[PDB]
Design a protein around this ligand. Structure first.
Ligand SMILES: O=P(O)(O)O[C@H]1[C@H](OP(=O)(O)O)[C@@H](OP(=O)(O)O)[C@H](OP(=O)(O)O)[C@@H](OP(=O)(O)O)[C@H]1OP(=O)(O)O
Ligand SMILES: [Zn+2]
Ligand SMILES: [Zn+2]
Ligand SMILES: [Zn+2]
Ligand SMILES: [Zn+2]
Ligand SMILES: [Zn+2]
Ligand SMILES: [Zn+2]
Lengths: 29, 140, 285, 44, 34, 299, 254, 167, 143
C-alpha cells in the first residue's frame, strides 16, 4: 500500500554526466 | 623475487585523498582478512589465558615487523608470569565450600556433583520497580 | 564469509570463537536470508549476532549488528546530517526489493571494498562529526538485557541469573522507542536528534562580533612557541595584514586581509588546531 | 572442473556433513590502540 | 535462494553416457573414411 | 616456477632435501613422512609409517641412505630412504624426543635431546645409550661438530652448551641468547653454528680450536616468535653464503651471511613457518609451515 | 638469569609440551561414542510436550512439523521389530531427537534361520491346539480404543503392570534339552562365544544335536520332499517356458 | 501431533482429527472451506499408514494391559494384516495397494486351510501372522522414499510457498 | 510394583539387603517424572532425572567397588535390570572422571565447538568463583 504514496516505488536516481546537477531543485504546486 | 624488489617502499608522496580507514589495506570493506593455520591447542591456551586473567601474548605479523610484546591488561601477566590454564598455577587461594553427601545409600539425602554451594543462597529497590510497573500499567 | 563489524562489537578480547549459519535469519531490512554470525564478546557479554545482511551494510556503510558507521560510530541520520541525505534508497515495499536487487549486482561488480556511491562522497568530512565522533570503545552496549522477572521483583534464579538486575529505563524518555528500520533509514531517530542538539552547542562558528574585524585574540599561547609557528601555519589562508604578539599574558592577536579568512582560521582552528604539542586557543577581540 | 563444482551444489538437493575448524586473522580499520586490548590484529 | 522442492521427473535416470563404439561408428573411423 | 606442495593433513614441522638433490622428505604432526621428487612433476611416492608421536625432526645421513626421525613418542627411528622400511627404534629417553642429529663422516652416531633434560649419544648398532648428559632444563636442539668430538646443545636456559665426548664435561658455554633456543645447525665447513631463539635473535657462533673467546660472530634480525611457541629451525646454504630461518610471521627470512642484509622476505604461507631448507646444488628453497603446504622457491 | 626463573620457565614449558602433544589430541583422534541415556529422559520430554499446544513450546511446533518427512521411515523400523508371539517383552534400541519430535527404532531383527523356523513351527502347534480347545475364542475389537480416548502414557499404566504369560510350549526336558534352555529367549545365543559370532549376531554354528532338535521342532512347517523330482514341470524353468508360450500347466500360473 | 500441527498450521479449524486418525469435519462445509481443506494424497497416505500402526500397537497394548491373552493377540495381529483394506482405506489414496491386499488374502487362504485341517474348525482363532506382517513391510520399504519425497514437497510448499510462477 | 523385572530368574543372593534403597530411589524417580513444569524453565525440567540416575548408579557402584558388599552376580544383575548404568560406571573407574555427572557433559559433539562443557572444568581454572550450572545436566563443577 505504501509502495506508492509514501516512498517512491522503485528509484532510479539519474546517472550523472559531465555537468552539475547539484544545484538544481524544483518548485512546489 | 628478491627482498630488494618485493619490499622496496612505494615511492614518494602519500595522497591524503584517503580517510584513515581508506588508507588501510583491505579485502572486505571492514578490513583485510585471510587464512591461518594455528595449532588448535595453542589457541585454546591463549583464549582461556586471556579470558581468565586478562593477559595473553598477542598475535600479530607486522606490528613492528618484529614483536617483543604481550597483549593483555597485563596486571596479571607481570604478576602471574604467563601462567597457562593447563599448566598448574604456582600458588592456590580462596576455595569456597559446597555441602555434599556422596554415598547414595541415602535417598533425598544424596547430592552428587549437584551440590548447591553452601555460601550462596532490595526492599529499597523493591519499590522503584513496583512504581515503574505501575507507570507502565497506567500507560497501557 | 566473515561479517562486517564495529571494533566495539567484535569484542575486547583479541581471541574470539565465532559461529556461522548459512541462512540463519532474514535481514530485518532487505528481508533476505543471509549468513549470520554469533560470537561472545566478553565475560559478561550477550552473544551478539549480525542483524542485517552484508549488502545493505555496504550500501549505507555500517556494522552489521550496530548499524553504526564504520569510521565514526555514528547513527546514520547523524552522518547524513553531516554530509549528504540524497543517497536515499526506497523504503517502500517492492521498490526496496527491486533497488536492492540491482544495487546487489552493482556491488557485485565493484572492487568489493567500498560502500558504492557514498564512498565517492565519504572522503570529504570533519565538519563537525569528527568532533562529535566517539573516541573509545563503548562496552556498556553489549551488556545482557534486563532481567524481566526481577524487574517485577521475583527472579528465582538467584545469583545464577545471567540477565542483569537493575532498574530499567523509564518508558517516558523519548530515547526509548528506537525502531530498527527507523534507525536504519534516518527517520525521527531519537539518538540522532540528541546528538544533533549536542552538535549545536559546540562553541564555534557564529563569530562576527564586529564588521571587517580580522583581529584574532589568541589565548593559551605559551612561552615555548614562536611566531614562525603561527605564520607557517597561517600562510595557507591568504594575505596576512599583520600579527600583534603579547607574551606577558601569552595572548597573540592576528589580522588578515579579509574577515572571511579570519572566520576560516577560527573554523579550521577552533578547539582543533594544536602545534608545538600545545593547544592553541582562539577567540574574537 | 568449474561446471562440475556448480553441478554438485545443484545436486546437493537430490542428495540431502561438514567438519572444518578454520581460523582467520583480521585487521580492523579502526585501530587507535584503545579499540582492542591493544593489538593491531585479532584472530577468530 | 534455492528451494527445497523436488519433482518426480527430475530424479536420476540414465546417468551413464553411451559412447559410440568402433563398429557403431566411432569418429575415428569417420575421419579416416573416403 | 614456485611449485606448491600439499598432502600433509597436519602441521609440517620439518623438511629436508636429499643429499644428492633428487628428493625431499617432510613430516609433521600427522605422523607421516612423505618423500617427494625434486624435479619431474614434483610427485609424492613413499609414505613412511610407524611413528605414533608427531615427527619433530628429520635428517639425512651424509650418504642419503638413512633418514633419522625424532618423534614425540620418545622413539627415534632410523629409516631406509630407498625402500621405506624401518631399521631401528632408539628407545631410551623418558620423555619426548625434541631433536636428533647424525654424525657425518665418522662411524655411525646419533645424538638426541628430550624433555627429560638429557642428551644421549647413540650407536645405532648397540640398541642402548652410550653416554648421557644430564642438563637440568629440557633440551630442544642438538648437533655434532665435523670432527664428531663435540656435542652442541640448545635448551631453554638461553645458553648453548658444548660437550666433550672424552672428558664428558661442560666444555663451553655460550651466552648471548635472552631466551630459549629452538634450533641449531653447523656450517658445512664446521666453522660456524647457527641459532634461533625466542628473543627473536638469529645468532651465528664460531667454534674453533683457537677461539676469540666471545664468539658472537654476527647477529641477524627479522625473525619473529609468538604465542604458538613452535620450535623454529634454521639452515645454512650449501656454500655457507646464505642463512635461512623460519618465523611465526608468515615470512621466510633469508640473509646475507656477511653484510647481514635481508635478501628475501617471502610470503605465500598463511601460518607460522617451522623450517626452511636449501637444495644442496641449486638455489632452491623448501619452506615448511604450519599451514600444511610447502613451497619450492627458486632464487 | 636466575635459577628460580629458569626452573619456573622449565616447569611451564613441560606443561605446555605435555598438553600440546597429548595422546588424546593425537592427529586422527576420534573421540568417544554417543553413549546412551537414561530412558526416563525421553519419557519425560514427550510427556511435557504431549500436545505441543503449550504457549511455552512455540518453536518445537515448527521443528516437529518438519520431521513428518521422516515419519514413514520411523514406522517401518517400528513395525519390523515386533516382538514375536513367544516374547513377553522385547526391548529395543531407540534414537529419539533430543527434542522429542521423533523416535526411530534403530535396529534390524536378525534371526538364526533354523531357530526362527522352529519357533514358529512351535507356534503353529500351539495356536492350532488353542483353537481346538477353547470353547469360544473371543477375538479383539478394532480399533481397540475410542477416537476420543487419548493414547496411553506407557509409564502410567503399562510400566507398572505384569506382562501376562506368552505362548510358549512345553519342551521335553529330556529329548529337547540342547535347544531347551535358550529356545524362547529373544536372541537366543547372543552372549556365547561358542555358538554365535557375538553381539553383531551374524554367523551361527551349532552342533548336530542342536540341528536335529530344531528340525524336529520345525516339522509342521516343512516340506517332506527329498529329491527334486516333485517339481518337474512345476519349477521356475517350466513357468518361464509356460509364460513365453502362453500355456499353463494344469495347476500352475497363467 | 504432526497431523494436527499441519491442520492448525493452515488454520483449518473446522477439521477434526481423532485418535485413530480419521479426519472428519466439525460442521457442514462452505464451498470455500471445502476448497481450502482438501488434503492431497500425500497427507492421506501418511494418515492411513499411521492408522495401520495404531491398530497394531493398540493390539499389543491391550495384551500388556491384561485385557487380552497371547493367543488372542496373535490372532488379532493376523486379522489386522489380512484385513487392511477393510480397516484402513489406504487404497483409496493409492490404488496400487491392492497388490498387497490380494497377497494377504491369498496367504490367509493358504494358511487357514492348512491350519484348520483336522478337529480344528472354521473358528476365529488362528494366529500365524508372520506372512501378512512381511507383506506390509515390503510395501513400506518402497513406499517410504515416496512419502519422503511427497511429504517433503508438501512441507516445502507449506513453508517456502507454492512457487507462484506458471513454471 | 517393581521395575517388572525382565529376567524371570530369581535375583542373586545379595538382593535383599540392597532392595530397599533401590525401591526408594526409584520411587523418587517416579516423583521426578511426575512433578510438573511451571516456572521451572525447560532445561531445568530434565535435571532431576539425571541427578537421580547418577545417584542410583553411584549407589551400586559404591556397594560393589568400595564397600565390597556385593558379588559380581548381583552387581551385573543390577546392571542388566537397568537399575545402574554401565557406561557411567565405566567412566568412574577412569583416573579423572570420578565425580562425573552424565555422559552428555563429556560428549564432544554435543557442543557447538566440540568441547566438554564447563561442567567439567576444574574450579581452579575459572578462578573467579563465578557460578555455573550446566545447561545439559544441572552439574556445578563435576571435577
Ligand atoms: O472358517 P473361518 O475360520 O471362520 O474362516 C472364514 C471363512 O473361511 P471358510 O468359509 O473358508 O471356512 C470365510 O470364507 P467365505 O465365508 O468367504 O467362504 C473367509 O472369507 P474369504 O473367502 O473372504 O476369506 C473369512 O474371512 P471374512 O470373514 O473376512 O470373509 C474367514 O474368516 P476371517 O474373517 O476370520 O478371515
Ligand atoms: Zn536486507
Ligand atoms: Zn555494531
Ligand atoms: Zn533475574
Ligand atoms: Zn553432568
Ligand atoms: Zn555438564
Ligand atoms: Zn557436571
Amino acid at each position: 500500500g505504501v509502495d506508492y504514496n509514501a516512498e517512491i516505488p522503485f528509484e532510479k536516481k539519474p546517472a550523472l554526466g559531465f555537468y552539475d546537477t547539484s544545484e538544481e531543485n524544483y518548485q512546489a504546486l | 623475487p628478491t627482498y630488494e624488489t618485493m619490499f622496496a617502499p612505494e615511492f614518494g608522496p602519500e595522497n591524503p585523498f584517503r580517510t584513515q580507514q581508506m588508507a588501510a589495506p583491505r579485502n572486505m570493506l571492514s578490513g583485510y582478512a585471510e587464512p591461518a593455520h594455528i595449532n588448535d591447542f595453542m589457541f585454546e591456551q591463549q583464549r582461556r589465558t586471556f579470558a581468565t586473567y586478562g593477559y595473553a601474548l598477542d598475535p600479530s605479523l607486522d606490528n613492528h615487523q618484529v614483536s617483543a610484546k604481550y597483549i593483555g591488561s597485563v596486571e596479571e601477566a607481570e604478576k602471574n608470569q604467563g601462567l597457562t590454564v593447563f599448566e598448574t598455577g604456582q600458588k592456590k587461594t580462596e576455595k569456597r565450600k559446597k555441602f555434599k553427601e556422596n554415598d547414595a545409600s541415602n535417598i533425598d539425602g544424596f547430592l552428587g556433583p549437584w551440590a548447591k554451594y553452601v555460601d550462596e543462597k532490595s526492599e529499597e529497590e523493591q519499590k522503584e520497580l513496583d512504581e515503574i510497573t505501575a507507570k507502565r500499567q497506567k500507560k497501557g | 564469509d566473515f561479517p562486517i563489524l564495529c571494533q566495539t562489537c567484535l569484542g575486547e578480547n583479541p581471541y574470539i570463537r565465532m559461529t556461522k549459519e548459512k541462512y540463519g535469519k532474514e535481514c530485518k531490512i532487505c528481508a533476505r536470508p543471509f549468513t549470520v554470525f554469533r560470537w561472545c564478546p566478553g565475560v559478561r557479554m550477550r552473544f551478539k549476532k549480525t542483524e542485517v545482511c552484508q549488502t545493505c551494510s555496504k550500501l549505507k556503510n555500517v556494522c552489521q549488528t550496530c548499524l553504526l558507521d564504520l569510521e565514526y560510530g555514528l547513527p546514520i541520520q547523524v552522518r547524513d546530517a553531516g554530509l549528504s541525505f540524497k543517497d536515499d534508497m526506497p523504503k517502500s515495499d517492492v521498490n526496496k526489493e527491486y533497488y536492492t536487487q540491482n544495487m546487489e549486482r552493482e556491488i557485485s561488480n565493484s572492487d568489493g571494498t567500498r560502500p558504492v556511491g557514498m564512498l565517492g562522497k565519504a572522503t570529504s568530512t570533519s565538519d563537525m562529526l569528527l568532533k562529535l565522533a566517539r573516541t573509545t570503545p563503548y562496552y556498556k552496549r553489549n551488556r545482557p538485557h534486563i532481567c524481566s522477572f526481577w524487574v517485577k521483583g521475583e527472579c528465582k534464579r538467584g545469583e545464577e541469573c545471567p540477565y542483569r538486575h537493575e532498574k530499567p529505563t523509564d518508558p517516558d524518555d523519548p530515547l526509548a522507542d528506537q525502531n530498527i528500520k527507523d534507525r536504519y533509514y534516518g527517520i525521527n531517530d531519537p539518538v540522532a536528534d540528541k546528538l544533533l542538539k549536542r552538535a549545536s552547542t559546540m562553541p564555534r562558528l557564529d563569530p562576527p562580533e564586529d564588521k571587517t574585524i580580522t583581529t584574532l585574540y589568541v589565548g593559551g599561547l605559551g612561552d615555548t612557541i614562536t611566531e614562525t609557528d603561527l605564520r607557517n601555519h597561517f600562510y595557507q589562508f591568504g594575505e596576512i595584514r599583520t600579527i600583534t604578539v603579547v607574551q606577558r599574558q601569552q595572548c597573540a592577536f592576528i589580522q588578515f586581509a579579509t574577515r572571511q579568512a579570519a572566520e576560516v582560521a577560527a573554523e579550521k582552528s577552533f578547539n582543533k588546531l594544536i602545534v608545538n604539542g600545545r593547544r592553541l586557543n582562539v577567540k574574537w577581540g | 572442473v568449474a561446471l562440475e563444482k556448480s553441478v554438485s551444489q545443484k545436486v546437493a538437493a537430490a542428495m540431502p556433513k561438514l567438519a572444518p575448524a578454520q581460523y582467520i586473522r583480521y585487521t580492523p580499520s579502526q585501530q587507535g590502540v584503545a579499540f582492542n586490548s591493544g593489538a593491531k590484529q585479532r584472530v577468530i | 535462494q534455492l528451494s527445497k522442492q523436488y519433482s518426480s521427473r527430475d530424479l536420476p535416470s540414465h546417468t551413464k553416457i553411451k559412447y559410440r563404439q568402433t563398429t557403431q561408428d566411432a569418429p575415428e573411423e569417420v575421419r579416416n573414411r573416403d | 616456477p614456485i611449485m606448491l606442495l600439499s598432502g600433509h593433513e597436519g602441521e609440517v614441522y620439518c623438511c629436508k632435501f636429499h643429499p644428492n638433490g633428487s628428493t625431499l622428505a617432510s613430516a609433521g604432526f600427522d605422523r607421516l613422512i612423505l618423500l617427494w621428487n625434486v624435479y619431474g612433476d614434483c610427485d609424492n611416492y613413499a609414505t613412511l609409517k610407524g611413528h605414533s608421536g608427531a615427527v619433530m625432526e628429520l635428517h639425512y645421513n651424509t650418504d642419503g641412505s638413512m633418514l633419522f626421525s625424532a618423534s614425540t613418542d620418545k622413539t627415534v627411528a632410523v629409516w631406509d630412504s630407498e625402500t621405506g622400511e624401518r631399521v631401528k627404534r632408539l628407545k631410551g629417553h623418558t620423555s619426548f624426543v625434541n631433536s636428533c642429529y647424525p654424525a657425518r663422516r665418522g662411524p655411525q652416531l646419533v645424538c638426541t635431546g628430550s624433555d627429560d633434560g638429557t642428551v644421549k649419544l647413540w650407536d645405532i648398532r648397540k640398541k642402548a645409550a652410550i653416554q648421557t648428559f644430564q642438563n637440568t632444563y629440557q633440551v630442544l636442539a642438538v648437533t655434532f661438530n665435523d670432527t664428531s668430538d663435540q656435542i652442541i646443545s640448545g635448551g631453554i636456559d638461553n645458553d648453548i652448551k658444548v660437550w666433550d665426548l672424552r672428558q664428558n664435561k661442560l666444555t663451553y658455554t655460550m651466552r648471548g641468547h635472552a631466551d630459549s633456543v629452538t634450533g641449531l645447525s653447523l656450517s658445512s665447513e664446521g666453522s660456524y653454528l647457527l641459532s634461533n631463539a625466542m628473543d627473536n635473535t638469529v645468532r651465528v657462533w664460531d667454534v674453533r680450536p683457537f677461539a676469540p673467546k666471545e664468539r658472537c660472530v654476527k647477529i641477524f634480525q627479522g625473525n619473529v616468535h609468538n604465542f604458538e611457541k613452535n620450535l623454529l629451525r634454521c639452515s645454512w646454504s650449501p656454500d655457507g653464503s646464505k642463512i635461512a630461518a623460519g618465523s611465526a610471521d608468515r615470512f621466510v627470512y633469508v640473509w646475507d651471511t656477511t653484510s647481514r642484509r635481508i635478501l628475501y622476505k617471502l610470503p605465500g604461507h598463511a601460518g607460522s613457518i617451522n623450517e626452511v631448507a636449501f637444495h644442496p646444488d641449486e638455489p632452491i628453497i623448501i619452506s615448511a609451515s604450519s599451514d600444511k603446504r610447502l613451497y619450492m622457491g627458486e632464487i | 638469569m636466575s635459577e628460580e626463573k629458569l626452573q619456573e620457565k622449565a616447569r611451564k614449558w613441560q606443561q605446555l609440551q605435555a598438553k600440546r602433544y597429548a595422546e588424546k589430541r593425537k592427529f586422527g583422534f576420534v573421540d568417544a561414542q554417543k553413549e546412551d541415556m537414561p530412558p526416563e529422559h525421553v519419557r519425560k520430554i514427550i510427556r511435557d510436550h504431549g500436545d505441543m499446544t503449550n504457549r511455552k513450546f512455540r518453536h518445537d511446533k515448527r521443528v516437529y512439523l518438519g520431521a513428518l518427512k521422516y515419519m514413514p521411515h520411523a514406522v517401518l523400523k517400528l513395525l519390523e521389530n515386533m516382538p514375536m508371539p513367544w516374547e513377553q517383552i522385547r526391548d529395543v534400541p531407540v534414537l529419539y531427537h533430543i527434542t522429542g519430535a521423533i523416535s526411530f527404532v534403530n535396529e534390524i531383527p536378525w534371526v538364526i534361520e533354523p531357530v526362527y523356523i522352529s519357533q514358529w513351527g512351535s507356534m503353529w502347534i500351539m495356536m492350532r491346539r488353542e483353537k481346538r480347545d477353547r470353547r469360544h475364542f473371543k477375538r479383539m475389537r478394532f480399533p481397540p480404543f475410542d477416537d476420543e480416548e487419548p493414547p496411553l502414557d506407557y509409564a502410567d499404566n503399562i510400566l507398572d503392570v505384569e506382562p501376562l504369560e506368552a505362548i510358549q510350549l512345553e519342551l521335553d526336558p529330556e529329548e529337547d534339552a540342547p535347544v531347551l534352555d535358550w529356545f524362547y529367549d529373544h536372541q537366543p545365543l547372543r552372549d556365547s562365544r561358542k555358538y554365535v559370532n557375538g553381539s553383531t549376531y551374524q554367523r551361527w554354528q551349532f552342533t548336530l544335536p542342536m540341528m536335529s532338535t530344531l528340525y524336529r521342532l520345525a516339522n509342521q512347517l516343512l516340506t517332506d520332499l527329498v529329491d527334486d523330482n516333485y517339481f518337474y514341470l512345476f519349477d521356475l524353468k517350466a513357468f518361464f517356458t509356460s509364460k513365453a508360450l502362453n500355456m499353463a500347466i494344469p495347476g500352475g500360473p497363467k | 501431533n504432526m497431523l494436527n500441527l499441519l491442520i492448525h498450521r493452515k488454520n483449518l479449524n473446522y477439521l477434526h482429527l481423532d485418535y485413530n486418525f480419521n479426519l472428519k469435519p466439525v460442521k457442514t462445509l462452505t464451498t470455500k472451506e471445502r476448497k481450502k481443506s482438501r488434503f492431497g494424497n500425500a497427507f492421506h497416505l501418511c494418515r492411513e499408514v499411521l492408522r495401520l500402526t495404531k491398530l497394531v500397537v493398540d493390539s499389543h497394548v491391550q495384551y500388556r494391559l491384561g485385557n487380552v491373552d497371547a493367543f488372542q493377540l496373535a490372532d488379532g495381529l493376523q486379522y489386522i494384516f489380512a484385513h487392511v483394506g477393510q480397516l484402513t482405506g489406504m487404497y483409496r489414496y493409492k490404488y496400487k495397494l491392492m497388490r498387497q491386499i490380494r497377497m494377504c488374502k491369498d496367504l490367509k487362504h493358504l494358511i487357514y486351510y492348512r491350519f484348520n485341517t483336522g478337529p480344528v474348525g472354521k473358528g476365529p482363532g488362528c494366529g500365524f501372522w508372520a506372512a501378512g506382517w512381511r507383506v506390509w513391510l515390503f510395501f513400506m520399504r518402497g513406499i517410504t522414499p515416496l512419502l519422503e519425497r511427497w511429504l517433503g514437497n508438501l512441507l516445502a510448499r507449506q513453508f517456502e510457498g507454492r512457487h507462484s510462477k506458471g513454471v | 510394583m517393581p521395575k517388572v523385572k525382565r529376567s524371570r530368574k530369581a535375583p542373586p543372593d545379595g538382593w535383599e539387603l540392597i532392595e530397599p534403597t533401590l525401591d526408594e530411589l526409584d520411587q523418587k524417580m517416579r516423583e521426578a517424572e511426575t512433578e510438573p513444569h511451571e516456572g521451572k524453565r525447560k532445561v531445568e525440567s530434565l535435571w532431576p532425572i539425571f541427578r537421580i540416575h547418577h545417584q542410583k548408579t553411584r549407589y551400586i557402584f559404591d556397594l560393589f567397588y568400595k564397600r565390597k558388599a556385593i558379588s559380581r552376580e548381583l552387581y551385573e544383575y543390577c546392571i542388566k535390570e537397568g537399575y545402574a548404568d554401565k557406561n557411567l560406571i565405566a567412566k568412574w573407574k577412569k583416573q579423572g572422571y570420578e565425580n562425573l555427572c552424565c555422559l552428555r557433559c563429556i560428549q564432544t559433539r554435543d557442543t557447538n565447538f566440540g568441547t566438554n562443557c564447563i561442567c567439567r572444568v576444574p574450579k581452579s581454572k575459572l578462578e573467579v568463583g563465578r557460578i555455573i550450572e550446566c545447561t545439559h545436566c544441572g552439574c556445578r563443577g563435576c571435577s
